[PDB]
């Protein structure tokens, strides 16, 4: 369908029981601040209905829109082969710094995130380099400067207002979570760490695994 000839690369982060409980209390605390300030709350991304588990992610490419099935296979195969040829056998994922808020492509959703640590970004640099080499030439770039894990997602209440009003409320939301909702970030950063032994790629409607 719409996803024909679309590819995207990412890391999958499955949380253990302790990490799930930490994210419950961190997000509850953030959302108490959102309530106090009459802001939209963040839906936790690590849980579904009835506490069904959902993995978290690190995006490693933009949405890659290839011109045809042949180019999809040519470029994704080269990506897979070159990632396999890397020396590394696993990459660490750990977080550094404060809350970030990233918008999706139509600004309808605002994701509460933390950036990757300097060593985590450094170990992913050779992966990003491979993606940059093979991705289609064909507006939300993924790069070393913005690698992150998103933990919650809120609706943009200002989606249909003037762009400048929506951007102002986004910047004051970013300031609000940083100034008033950051006290449990040391607990999050100490515990939300992972080691990934494979990448994933969405290709069309299928997901493939790319071993390290």
mmCIF file with all atom_site columns, C-alpha atoms in Angstrom:
data_model
loop_
_atom_site.group_PDB
_atom_site.id
_atom_site.type_symbol
_atom_site.label_atom_id
_atom_site.label_alt_id
_atom_site.label_comp_id
_atom_site.label_asym_id
_atom_site.label_entity_id
_atom_site.label_seq_id
_atom_site.pdbx_PDB_ins_code
_atom_site.Cartn_x
_atom_site.Cartn_y
_atom_site.Cartn_z
_atom_site.occupancy
_atom_site.B_iso_or_equiv
_atom_site.pdbx_formal_charge
_atom_site.auth_seq_id
_atom_site.auth_comp_id
_atom_site.auth_asym_id
_atom_site.auth_atom_id
_atom_site.pdbx_PDB_model_num
ATOM 1   C CA . UNK A 1 1   ? 0.000  0.000  0.000  1.00 0.00 ? 1   UNK A CA 1
ATOM 2   C CA . UNK A 1 2   ? 1.372  3.354  1.079  1.00 0.00 ? 2   UNK A CA 1
ATOM 3   C CA . UNK A 1 3   ? 4.319  1.539  2.616  1.00 0.00 ? 3   UNK A CA 1
ATOM 4   C CA . UNK A 1 4   ? 5.409  0.091  -0.748 1.00 0.00 ? 4   UNK A CA 1
ATOM 5   C CA . UNK A 1 5   ? 9.178  0.500  -1.190 1.00 0.00 ? 5   UNK A CA 1
ATOM 6   C CA . UNK A 1 6   ? 9.542  2.188  2.238  1.00 0.00 ? 6   UNK A CA 1
ATOM 7   C CA . UNK A 1 7   ? 12.438 1.220  4.512  1.00 0.00 ? 7   UNK A CA 1
ATOM 8   C CA . UNK A 1 8   ? 13.506 2.352  7.973  1.00 0.00 ? 8   UNK A CA 1
ATOM 9   C CA . UNK A 1 9   ? 16.239 1.157  10.364 1.00 0.00 ? 9   UNK A CA 1
ATOM 10  C CA . UNK A 1 10  ? 16.044 1.049  14.160 1.00 0.00 ? 10  UNK A CA 1
ATOM 11  C CA . UNK A 1 11  ? 17.204 -0.597 17.407 1.00 0.00 ? 11  UNK A CA 1
ATOM 12  C CA . UNK A 1 12  ? 14.624 -2.380 19.556 1.00 0.00 ? 12  UNK A CA 1
ATOM 13  C CA . UNK A 1 13  ? 14.817 -2.013 23.373 1.00 0.00 ? 13  UNK A CA 1
ATOM 14  C CA . UNK A 1 14  ? 12.887 -4.563 25.428 1.00 0.00 ? 14  UNK A CA 1
ATOM 15  C CA . UNK A 1 15  ? 12.460 -3.352 29.017 1.00 0.00 ? 15  UNK A CA 1
ATOM 16  C CA . UNK A 1 16  ? 12.764 -5.678 31.945 1.00 0.00 ? 16  UNK A CA 1
ATOM 17  C CA . UNK A 1 17  ? 10.431 -5.564 34.920 1.00 0.00 ? 17  UNK A CA 1
ATOM 18  C CA . UNK A 1 18  ? 12.541 -3.061 36.870 1.00 0.00 ? 18  UNK A CA 1
ATOM 19  C CA . UNK A 1 19  ? 12.874 -0.711 33.894 1.00 0.00 ? 19  UNK A CA 1
ATOM 20  C CA . UNK A 1 20  ? 9.114  -0.854 33.315 1.00 0.00 ? 20  UNK A CA 1
ATOM 21  C CA . UNK A 1 21  ? 8.442  0.160  36.941 1.00 0.00 ? 21  UNK A CA 1
ATOM 22  C CA . UNK A 1 22  ? 10.949 3.002  36.773 1.00 0.00 ? 22  UNK A CA 1
ATOM 23  C CA . UNK A 1 23  ? 9.302  4.308  33.633 1.00 0.00 ? 23  UNK A CA 1
ATOM 24  C CA . UNK A 1 24  ? 5.870  4.090  35.315 1.00 0.00 ? 24  UNK A CA 1
ATOM 25  C CA . UNK A 1 25  ? 6.983  6.361  38.158 1.00 0.00 ? 25  UNK A CA 1
ATOM 26  C CA . UNK A 1 26  ? 8.983  8.743  35.942 1.00 0.00 ? 26  UNK A CA 1
ATOM 27  C CA . UNK A 1 27  ? 6.106  9.300  33.512 1.00 0.00 ? 27  UNK A CA 1
ATOM 28  C CA . UNK A 1 28  ? 3.566  9.615  36.319 1.00 0.00 ? 28  UNK A CA 1
ATOM 29  C CA . UNK A 1 29  ? 5.703  12.363 37.771 1.00 0.00 ? 29  UNK A CA 1
ATOM 30  C CA . UNK A 1 30  ? 6.044  14.197 34.452 1.00 0.00 ? 30  UNK A CA 1
ATOM 31  C CA . UNK A 1 31  ? 2.316  13.990 33.896 1.00 0.00 ? 31  UNK A CA 1
ATOM 32  C CA . UNK A 1 32  ? 1.593  15.374 37.379 1.00 0.00 ? 32  UNK A CA 1
ATOM 33  C CA . UNK A 1 33  ? 3.518  18.466 36.255 1.00 0.00 ? 33  UNK A CA 1
ATOM 34  C CA . UNK A 1 34  ? 1.542  18.545 32.978 1.00 0.00 ? 34  UNK A CA 1
ATOM 35  C CA . UNK A 1 35  ? -1.713 18.394 34.973 1.00 0.00 ? 35  UNK A CA 1
ATOM 36  C CA . UNK A 1 36  ? -0.635 21.209 37.295 1.00 0.00 ? 36  UNK A CA 1
ATOM 37  C CA . UNK A 1 37  ? 0.100  23.395 34.276 1.00 0.00 ? 37  UNK A CA 1
ATOM 38  C CA . UNK A 1 38  ? -3.031 22.403 32.303 1.00 0.00 ? 38  UNK A CA 1
ATOM 39  C CA . UNK A 1 39  ? -0.939 20.758 29.578 1.00 0.00 ? 39  UNK A CA 1
ATOM 40  C CA . UNK A 1 40  ? -1.586 17.571 27.622 1.00 0.00 ? 40  UNK A CA 1
ATOM 41  C CA . UNK A 1 41  ? -0.207 14.397 29.216 1.00 0.00 ? 41  UNK A CA 1
ATOM 42  C CA . UNK A 1 42  ? 2.209  11.856 27.724 1.00 0.00 ? 42  UNK A CA 1
ATOM 43  C CA . UNK A 1 43  ? 1.000  8.356  26.930 1.00 0.00 ? 43  UNK A CA 1
ATOM 44  C CA . UNK A 1 44  ? 3.692  5.897  28.111 1.00 0.00 ? 44  UNK A CA 1
ATOM 45  C CA . UNK A 1 45  ? 5.294  4.174  25.112 1.00 0.00 ? 45  UNK A CA 1
ATOM 46  C CA . UNK A 1 46  ? 6.461  1.102  27.021 1.00 0.00 ? 46  UNK A CA 1
ATOM 47  C CA . UNK A 1 47  ? 2.969  -0.199 27.841 1.00 0.00 ? 47  UNK A CA 1
ATOM 48  C CA . UNK A 1 48  ? -0.174 -1.080 25.968 1.00 0.00 ? 48  UNK A CA 1
ATOM 49  C CA . UNK A 1 49  ? -3.642 -1.929 27.175 1.00 0.00 ? 49  UNK A CA 1
ATOM 50  C CA . UNK A 1 50  ? -3.787 -4.145 30.255 1.00 0.00 ? 50  UNK A CA 1
ATOM 51  C CA . UNK A 1 51  ? -0.063 -3.554 30.718 1.00 0.00 ? 51  UNK A CA 1
ATOM 52  C CA . UNK A 1 52  ? 0.859  -5.387 27.525 1.00 0.00 ? 52  UNK A CA 1
ATOM 53  C CA . UNK A 1 53  ? 4.566  -4.684 26.969 1.00 0.00 ? 53  UNK A CA 1
ATOM 54  C CA . UNK A 1 54  ? 5.869  -2.623 24.084 1.00 0.00 ? 54  UNK A CA 1
ATOM 55  C CA . UNK A 1 55  ? 9.565  -2.302 23.238 1.00 0.00 ? 55  UNK A CA 1
ATOM 56  C CA . UNK A 1 56  ? 11.109 1.136  22.955 1.00 0.00 ? 56  UNK A CA 1
ATOM 57  C CA . UNK A 1 57  ? 13.241 2.144  19.966 1.00 0.00 ? 57  UNK A CA 1
ATOM 58  C CA . UNK A 1 58  ? 16.188 4.134  18.676 1.00 0.00 ? 58  UNK A CA 1
ATOM 59  C CA . UNK A 1 59  ? 15.542 5.404  15.141 1.00 0.00 ? 59  UNK A CA 1
ATOM 60  C CA . UNK A 1 60  ? 18.641 4.969  12.954 1.00 0.00 ? 60  UNK A CA 1
ATOM 61  C CA . UNK A 1 61  ? 17.308 6.306  9.635  1.00 0.00 ? 61  UNK A CA 1
ATOM 62  C CA . UNK A 1 62  ? 14.708 8.637  8.241  1.00 0.00 ? 62  UNK A CA 1
ATOM 63  C CA . UNK A 1 63  ? 11.700 7.095  6.471  1.00 0.00 ? 63  UNK A CA 1
ATOM 64  C CA . UNK A 1 64  ? 13.491 5.966  3.333  1.00 0.00 ? 64  UNK A CA 1
ATOM 65  C CA . UNK A 1 65  ? 11.325 6.150  0.254  1.00 0.00 ? 65  UNK A CA 1
ATOM 66  C CA . UNK A 1 66  ? 12.909 4.110  -2.484 1.00 0.00 ? 66  UNK A CA 1
ATOM 67  C CA . UNK A 1 67  ? 11.997 4.570  -6.139 1.00 0.00 ? 67  UNK A CA 1
ATOM 68  C CA . UNK A 1 68  ? 11.131 0.921  -6.788 1.00 0.00 ? 68  UNK A CA 1
ATOM 69  C CA . UNK A 1 69  ? 11.485 -2.582 -5.406 1.00 0.00 ? 69  UNK A CA 1
ATOM 70  C CA . UNK A 1 70  ? 14.836 -3.033 -7.144 1.00 0.00 ? 70  UNK A CA 1
ATOM 71  C CA . UNK A 1 71  ? 16.371 0.016  -5.516 1.00 0.00 ? 71  UNK A CA 1
ATOM 72  C CA . UNK A 1 72  ? 14.895 -0.995 -2.126 1.00 0.00 ? 72  UNK A CA 1
ATOM 73  C CA . UNK A 1 73  ? 16.563 -4.404 -2.376 1.00 0.00 ? 73  UNK A CA 1
ATOM 74  C CA . UNK A 1 74  ? 19.844 -3.065 -3.797 1.00 0.00 ? 74  UNK A CA 1
ATOM 75  C CA . UNK A 1 75  ? 20.255 -0.416 -1.119 1.00 0.00 ? 75  UNK A CA 1
ATOM 76  C CA . UNK A 1 76  ? 18.885 -2.354 1.873  1.00 0.00 ? 76  UNK A CA 1
ATOM 77  C CA . UNK A 1 77  ? 20.977 -5.398 0.967  1.00 0.00 ? 77  UNK A CA 1
ATOM 78  C CA . UNK A 1 78  ? 24.118 -3.260 0.809  1.00 0.00 ? 78  UNK A CA 1
ATOM 79  C CA . UNK A 1 79  ? 23.163 -1.752 4.177  1.00 0.00 ? 79  UNK A CA 1
ATOM 80  C CA . UNK A 1 80  ? 22.683 -5.225 5.713  1.00 0.00 ? 80  UNK A CA 1
ATOM 81  C CA . UNK A 1 81  ? 25.931 -6.576 4.267  1.00 0.00 ? 81  UNK A CA 1
ATOM 82  C CA . UNK A 1 82  ? 27.999 -3.581 5.339  1.00 0.00 ? 82  UNK A CA 1
ATOM 83  C CA . UNK A 1 83  ? 26.527 -3.579 8.860  1.00 0.00 ? 83  UNK A CA 1
ATOM 84  C CA . UNK A 1 84  ? 27.393 -7.282 9.172  1.00 0.00 ? 84  UNK A CA 1
ATOM 85  C CA . UNK A 1 85  ? 30.916 -6.479 7.985  1.00 0.00 ? 85  UNK A CA 1
ATOM 86  C CA . UNK A 1 86  ? 31.396 -4.030 10.853 1.00 0.00 ? 86  UNK A CA 1
ATOM 87  C CA . UNK A 1 87  ? 33.704 -5.227 13.603 1.00 0.00 ? 87  UNK A CA 1
ATOM 88  C CA . UNK A 1 88  ? 31.243 -4.519 16.424 1.00 0.00 ? 88  UNK A CA 1
ATOM 89  C CA . UNK A 1 89  ? 29.160 -7.409 17.734 1.00 0.00 ? 89  UNK A CA 1
ATOM 90  C CA . UNK A 1 90  ? 26.780 -5.365 19.852 1.00 0.00 ? 90  UNK A CA 1
ATOM 91  C CA . UNK A 1 91  ? 26.154 -1.707 20.520 1.00 0.00 ? 91  UNK A CA 1
ATOM 92  C CA . UNK A 1 92  ? 25.397 -0.203 23.938 1.00 0.00 ? 92  UNK A CA 1
ATOM 93  C CA . UNK A 1 93  ? 22.418 2.071  24.441 1.00 0.00 ? 93  UNK A CA 1
ATOM 94  C CA . UNK A 1 94  ? 22.470 4.511  27.345 1.00 0.00 ? 94  UNK A CA 1
ATOM 95  C CA . UNK A 1 95  ? 21.114 8.025  27.786 1.00 0.00 ? 95  UNK A CA 1
ATOM 96  C CA . UNK A 1 96  ? 22.537 11.366 28.815 1.00 0.00 ? 96  UNK A CA 1
ATOM 97  C CA . UNK A 1 97  ? 21.198 14.830 29.550 1.00 0.00 ? 97  UNK A CA 1
ATOM 98  C CA . UNK A 1 98  ? 17.701 16.152 30.066 1.00 0.00 ? 98  UNK A CA 1
ATOM 99  C CA . UNK A 1 99  ? 14.245 15.796 28.587 1.00 0.00 ? 99  UNK A CA 1
ATOM 100 C CA . UNK A 1 100 ? 13.784 16.552 24.897 1.00 0.00 ? 100 UNK A CA 1
ATOM 101 C CA . UNK A 1 101 ? 10.516 16.959 22.986 1.00 0.00 ? 101 UNK A CA 1
ATOM 102 C CA . UNK A 1 102 ? 10.503 15.854 19.329 1.00 0.00 ? 102 UNK A CA 1
ATOM 103 C CA . UNK A 1 103 ? 7.572  16.332 16.930 1.00 0.00 ? 103 UNK A CA 1
ATOM 104 C CA . UNK A 1 104 ? 6.496  13.779 14.343 1.00 0.00 ? 104 UNK A CA 1
ATOM 105 C CA . UNK A 1 105 ? 6.185  14.625 10.627 1.00 0.00 ? 105 UNK A CA 1
ATOM 106 C CA . UNK A 1 106 ? 2.856  16.545 10.817 1.00 0.00 ? 106 UNK A CA 1
ATOM 107 C CA . UNK A 1 107 ? 3.447  17.940 14.340 1.00 0.00 ? 107 UNK A CA 1
ATOM 108 C CA . UNK A 1 108 ? 0.382  16.063 15.598 1.00 0.00 ? 108 UNK A CA 1
ATOM 109 C CA . UNK A 1 109 ? 2.365  14.204 18.295 1.00 0.00 ? 109 UNK A CA 1
ATOM 110 C CA . UNK A 1 110 ? 5.051  15.423 20.684 1.00 0.00 ? 110 UNK A CA 1
ATOM 111 C CA . UNK A 1 111 ? 7.457  12.766 21.954 1.00 0.00 ? 111 UNK A CA 1
ATOM 112 C CA . UNK A 1 112 ? 9.149  13.037 25.341 1.00 0.00 ? 112 UNK A CA 1
ATOM 113 C CA . UNK A 1 113 ? 12.676 11.687 24.836 1.00 0.00 ? 113 UNK A CA 1
ATOM 114 C CA . UNK A 1 114 ? 16.217 11.551 26.217 1.00 0.00 ? 114 UNK A CA 1
ATOM 115 C CA . UNK A 1 115 ? 19.272 11.779 23.979 1.00 0.00 ? 115 UNK A CA 1
ATOM 116 C CA . UNK A 1 116 ? 21.776 8.955  23.674 1.00 0.00 ? 116 UNK A CA 1
ATOM 117 C CA . UNK A 1 117 ? 25.011 9.151  25.656 1.00 0.00 ? 117 UNK A CA 1
ATOM 118 C CA . UNK A 1 118 ? 28.263 10.135 23.966 1.00 0.00 ? 118 UNK A CA 1
ATOM 119 C CA . UNK A 1 119 ? 29.632 6.541  23.891 1.00 0.00 ? 119 UNK A CA 1
ATOM 120 C CA . UNK A 1 120 ? 26.332 5.192  22.539 1.00 0.00 ? 120 UNK A CA 1
ATOM 121 C CA . UNK A 1 121 ? 26.341 7.736  19.716 1.00 0.00 ? 121 UNK A CA 1
ATOM 122 C CA . UNK A 1 122 ? 29.994 7.030  18.982 1.00 0.00 ? 122 UNK A CA 1
ATOM 123 C CA . UNK A 1 123 ? 29.385 3.298  18.596 1.00 0.00 ? 123 UNK A CA 1
ATOM 124 C CA . UNK A 1 124 ? 26.452 3.967  16.269 1.00 0.00 ? 124 UNK A CA 1
ATOM 125 C CA . UNK A 1 125 ? 28.440 6.366  14.066 1.00 0.00 ? 125 UNK A CA 1
ATOM 126 C CA . UNK A 1 126 ? 29.635 3.566  11.716 1.00 0.00 ? 126 UNK A CA 1
ATOM 127 C CA . UNK A 1 127 ? 26.020 2.375  11.341 1.00 0.00 ? 127 UNK A CA 1
ATOM 128 C CA . UNK A 1 128 ? 24.762 5.868  10.516 1.00 0.00 ? 128 UNK A CA 1
ATOM 129 C CA . UNK A 1 129 ? 27.619 6.221  8.031  1.00 0.00 ? 129 UNK A CA 1
ATOM 130 C CA . UNK A 1 130 ? 26.392 3.140  6.168  1.00 0.00 ? 130 UNK A CA 1
ATOM 131 C CA . UNK A 1 131 ? 22.823 4.503  6.130  1.00 0.00 ? 131 UNK A CA 1
ATOM 132 C CA . UNK A 1 132 ? 23.998 7.856  4.782  1.00 0.00 ? 132 UNK A CA 1
ATOM 133 C CA . UNK A 1 133 ? 25.883 6.068  2.003  1.00 0.00 ? 133 UNK A CA 1
ATOM 134 C CA . UNK A 1 134 ? 22.930 4.029  0.742  1.00 0.00 ? 134 UNK A CA 1
ATOM 135 C CA . UNK A 1 135 ? 19.774 5.942  1.617  1.00 0.00 ? 135 UNK A CA 1
ATOM 136 C CA . UNK A 1 136 ? 17.668 7.358  -1.242 1.00 0.00 ? 136 UNK A CA 1
ATOM 137 C CA . UNK A 1 137 ? 18.415 10.906 -2.313 1.00 0.00 ? 137 UNK A CA 1
ATOM 138 C CA . UNK A 1 138 ? 14.628 11.590 -2.272 1.00 0.00 ? 138 UNK A CA 1
ATOM 139 C CA . UNK A 1 139 ? 12.351 16.433 6.262  1.00 0.00 ? 139 UNK A CA 1
ATOM 140 C CA . UNK A 1 140 ? 13.081 14.879 9.676  1.00 0.00 ? 140 UNK A CA 1
ATOM 141 C CA . UNK A 1 141 ? 16.655 13.664 9.302  1.00 0.00 ? 141 UNK A CA 1
ATOM 142 C CA . UNK A 1 142 ? 18.120 11.146 11.709 1.00 0.00 ? 142 UNK A CA 1
ATOM 143 C CA . UNK A 1 143 ? 21.723 11.769 12.668 1.00 0.00 ? 143 UNK A CA 1
ATOM 144 C CA . UNK A 1 144 ? 24.333 11.742 15.400 1.00 0.00 ? 144 UNK A CA 1
ATOM 145 C CA . UNK A 1 145 ? 23.047 15.077 16.631 1.00 0.00 ? 145 UNK A CA 1
ATOM 146 C CA . UNK A 1 146 ? 19.553 13.796 17.441 1.00 0.00 ? 146 UNK A CA 1
ATOM 147 C CA . UNK A 1 147 ? 19.810 10.104 18.389 1.00 0.00 ? 147 UNK A CA 1
ATOM 148 C CA . UNK A 1 148 ? 17.330 9.547  21.215 1.00 0.00 ? 148 UNK A CA 1
ATOM 149 C CA . UNK A 1 149 ? 14.911 7.182  22.954 1.00 0.00 ? 149 UNK A CA 1
ATOM 150 C CA . UNK A 1 150 ? 11.304 8.362  23.223 1.00 0.00 ? 150 UNK A CA 1
ATOM 151 C CA . UNK A 1 151 ? 9.465  7.381  26.407 1.00 0.00 ? 151 UNK A CA 1
ATOM 152 C CA . UNK A 1 152 ? 6.071  9.061  26.110 1.00 0.00 ? 152 UNK A CA 1
ATOM 153 C CA . UNK A 1 153 ? 3.918  10.758 23.517 1.00 0.00 ? 153 UNK A CA 1
ATOM 154 C CA . UNK A 1 154 ? 1.425  13.617 23.863 1.00 0.00 ? 154 UNK A CA 1
ATOM 155 C CA . UNK A 1 155 ? -1.039 15.131 21.395 1.00 0.00 ? 155 UNK A CA 1
ATOM 156 C CA . UNK A 1 156 ? -0.194 18.594 20.142 1.00 0.00 ? 156 UNK A CA 1
ATOM 157 C CA . UNK A 1 157 ? -3.157 20.655 21.376 1.00 0.00 ? 157 UNK A CA 1
ATOM 158 C CA . UNK A 1 158 ? -2.057 23.517 19.099 1.00 0.00 ? 158 UNK A CA 1
ATOM 159 C CA . UNK A 1 159 ? -1.832 21.465 15.895 1.00 0.00 ? 159 UNK A CA 1
ATOM 160 C CA . UNK A 1 160 ? -4.388 23.526 13.976 1.00 0.00 ? 160 UNK A CA 1
ATOM 161 C CA . UNK A 1 161 ? -3.345 26.927 15.340 1.00 0.00 ? 161 UNK A CA 1
ATOM 162 C CA . UNK A 1 162 ? -0.834 29.270 13.695 1.00 0.00 ? 162 UNK A CA 1
ATOM 163 C CA . UNK A 1 163 ? 2.565  27.602 13.387 1.00 0.00 ? 163 UNK A CA 1
ATOM 164 C CA . UNK A 1 164 ? 4.086  30.300 15.584 1.00 0.00 ? 164 UNK A CA 1
ATOM 165 C CA . UNK A 1 165 ? 1.586  29.617 18.373 1.00 0.00 ? 165 UNK A CA 1
ATOM 166 C CA . UNK A 1 166 ? 2.220  25.866 18.155 1.00 0.00 ? 166 UNK A CA 1
ATOM 167 C CA . UNK A 1 167 ? 5.982  26.423 18.143 1.00 0.00 ? 167 UNK A CA 1
ATOM 168 C CA . UNK A 1 168 ? 5.749  28.766 21.150 1.00 0.00 ? 168 UNK A CA 1
ATOM 169 C CA . UNK A 1 169 ? 3.756  26.204 23.163 1.00 0.00 ? 169 UNK A CA 1
ATOM 170 C CA . UNK A 1 170 ? 6.225  23.485 22.145 1.00 0.00 ? 170 UNK A CA 1
ATOM 171 C CA . UNK A 1 171 ? 9.176  25.574 23.344 1.00 0.00 ? 171 UNK A CA 1
ATOM 172 C CA . UNK A 1 172 ? 7.460  26.394 26.627 1.00 0.00 ? 172 UNK A CA 1
ATOM 173 C CA . UNK A 1 173 ? 6.586  22.703 27.010 1.00 0.00 ? 173 UNK A CA 1
ATOM 174 C CA . UNK A 1 174 ? 10.263 21.841 26.470 1.00 0.00 ? 174 UNK A CA 1
ATOM 175 C CA . UNK A 1 175 ? 11.222 24.433 29.087 1.00 0.00 ? 175 UNK A CA 1
ATOM 176 C CA . UNK A 1 176 ? 8.548  23.217 31.496 1.00 0.00 ? 176 UNK A CA 1
ATOM 177 C CA . UNK A 1 177 ? 9.572  19.550 31.528 1.00 0.00 ? 177 UNK A CA 1
ATOM 178 C CA . UNK A 1 178 ? 13.231 20.554 31.830 1.00 0.00 ? 178 UNK A CA 1
ATOM 179 C CA . UNK A 1 179 ? 12.729 23.005 34.704 1.00 0.00 ? 179 UNK A CA 1
ATOM 180 C CA . UNK A 1 180 ? 9.943  21.346 36.702 1.00 0.00 ? 180 UNK A CA 1
ATOM 181 C CA . UNK A 1 181 ? 9.820  17.640 35.718 1.00 0.00 ? 181 UNK A CA 1
ATOM 182 C CA . UNK A 1 182 ? 13.495 16.502 35.698 1.00 0.00 ? 182 UNK A CA 1
ATOM 183 C CA . UNK A 1 183 ? 14.165 15.274 39.263 1.00 0.00 ? 183 UNK A CA 1
ATOM 184 C CA . UNK A 1 184 ? 13.848 11.566 38.453 1.00 0.00 ? 184 UNK A CA 1
ATOM 185 C CA . UNK A 1 185 ? 16.095 11.686 35.389 1.00 0.00 ? 185 UNK A CA 1
ATOM 186 C CA . UNK A 1 186 ? 19.159 10.342 37.290 1.00 0.00 ? 186 UNK A CA 1
ATOM 187 C CA . UNK A 1 187 ? 17.115 7.249  38.165 1.00 0.00 ? 187 UNK A CA 1
ATOM 188 C CA . UNK A 1 188 ? 16.048 6.854  34.539 1.00 0.00 ? 188 UNK A CA 1
ATOM 189 C CA . UNK A 1 189 ? 19.557 7.291  33.104 1.00 0.00 ? 189 UNK A CA 1
ATOM 190 C CA . UNK A 1 190 ? 21.062 4.864  35.620 1.00 0.00 ? 190 UNK A CA 1
ATOM 191 C CA . UNK A 1 191 ? 18.586 2.110  34.769 1.00 0.00 ? 191 UNK A CA 1
ATOM 192 C CA . UNK A 1 192 ? 17.424 2.542  31.140 1.00 0.00 ? 192 UNK A CA 1
ATOM 193 C CA . UNK A 1 193 ? 20.497 0.983  29.572 1.00 0.00 ? 193 UNK A CA 1
ATOM 194 C CA . UNK A 1 194 ? 20.614 -1.778 26.964 1.00 0.00 ? 194 UNK A CA 1
ATOM 195 C CA . UNK A 1 195 ? 22.982 -3.784 24.781 1.00 0.00 ? 195 UNK A CA 1
ATOM 196 C CA . UNK A 1 196 ? 21.678 -4.532 21.282 1.00 0.00 ? 196 UNK A CA 1
ATOM 197 C CA . UNK A 1 197 ? 23.072 -7.505 19.326 1.00 0.00 ? 197 UNK A CA 1
ATOM 198 C CA . UNK A 1 198 ? 21.075 -6.769 16.143 1.00 0.00 ? 198 UNK A CA 1
ATOM 199 C CA . UNK A 1 199 ? 19.346 -3.974 14.250 1.00 0.00 ? 199 UNK A CA 1
ATOM 200 C CA . UNK A 1 200 ? 15.841 -4.139 12.795 1.00 0.00 ? 200 UNK A CA 1
ATOM 201 C CA . UNK A 1 201 ? 14.588 -2.847 9.459  1.00 0.00 ? 201 UNK A CA 1
ATOM 202 C CA . UNK A 1 202 ? 10.987 -2.177 8.503  1.00 0.00 ? 202 UNK A CA 1
ATOM 203 C CA . UNK A 1 203 ? 10.629 -2.909 4.784  1.00 0.00 ? 203 UNK A CA 1
ATOM 204 C CA . UNK A 1 204 ? 7.125  -2.285 3.511  1.00 0.00 ? 204 UNK A CA 1
ATOM 205 C CA . UNK A 1 205 ? 4.905  -4.055 6.059  1.00 0.00 ? 205 UNK A CA 1
ATOM 206 C CA . UNK A 1 206 ? 7.557  -6.575 7.123  1.00 0.00 ? 206 UNK A CA 1
ATOM 207 C CA . UNK A 1 207 ? 10.269 -6.335 9.783  1.00 0.00 ? 207 UNK A CA 1
ATOM 208 C CA . UNK A 1 208 ? 13.660 -7.948 9.188  1.00 0.00 ? 208 UNK A CA 1
ATOM 209 C CA . UNK A 1 209 ? 16.540 -8.506 11.578 1.00 0.00 ? 209 UNK A CA 1
ATOM 210 C CA . UNK A 1 210 ? 20.108 -7.423 10.795 1.00 0.00 ? 210 UNK A CA 1
ATOM 211 C CA . UNK A 1 211 ? 22.586 -9.205 13.095 1.00 0.00 ? 211 UNK A CA 1
ATOM 212 C CA . UNK A 1 212 ? 25.675 -7.495 14.450 1.00 0.00 ? 212 UNK A CA 1
#
